Write a protein that binds this ligand. Sequence first.
Ligand SMILES: Nc1ncnc2c1ncn2[C@@H]1O[C@H](COP(=O)(O)OP(=O)(O)O)[C@@H](O)[C@H]1O
Ligand SMILES: [Mg+2]
Length: 177
Amino acid sequence: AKRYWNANLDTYHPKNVSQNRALLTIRVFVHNFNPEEGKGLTFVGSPGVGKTHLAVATLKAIYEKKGIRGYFFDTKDLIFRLKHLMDEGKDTKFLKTVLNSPVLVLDDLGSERLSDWQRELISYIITYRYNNLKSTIITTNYSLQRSSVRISADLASRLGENVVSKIYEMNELLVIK
Ligand SMILES: Nc1ncnc2c1ncn2[C@@H]1O[C@H](COP(=O)(O)OP(=O)(O)O)[C@@H](O)[C@H]1O
Ligand SMILES: [Mg+2]
């Protein structure tokens, strides 16, 4: 939660054209935000680049100018949590509040490779939020450099074609450099 205590659309000081465009987009996005549209953003990019900073920021600006409460998860942390209350088998309540969330930040959704069972949980959670028009914000890592659709196949390679295709029809792509 709070290495990003300070994370605000407002500390925000962009340092290249990438970051400025990203901040403009985010601003427009938050201002027209409608839990109902199930629209989101995807932040790609090498690391230490302020992708996650911007996603926390986006989540805050939402509920500051729209009073809607999001949720912020490290994708692996979420998955790991869920598998464990899902085979202890008791809590359907955590799963439901995560799936039905009006805004959800899946930080690092899928950088690195995901074993069959984490793959299954992601596909589930994304199929659900896709079907139910639930706005979902994603940050993922991309590294080899000079776009659109390689970023597609690269993401597709550890997430699956299916999840990535859906991610695209829900989210606008913001490459931060
Ligand atoms: N433009 C910026 N303004 C303020 N802080 C930033 C900016 N870019 C990066 N940071 C800070 O740098 C650190 C790393 O950023 P992070 O969001 O984790 O990048 P990434 O998620 O791309 O790895 C964070 O603590 C974040 O607060
Ligand atoms: Mg990050």
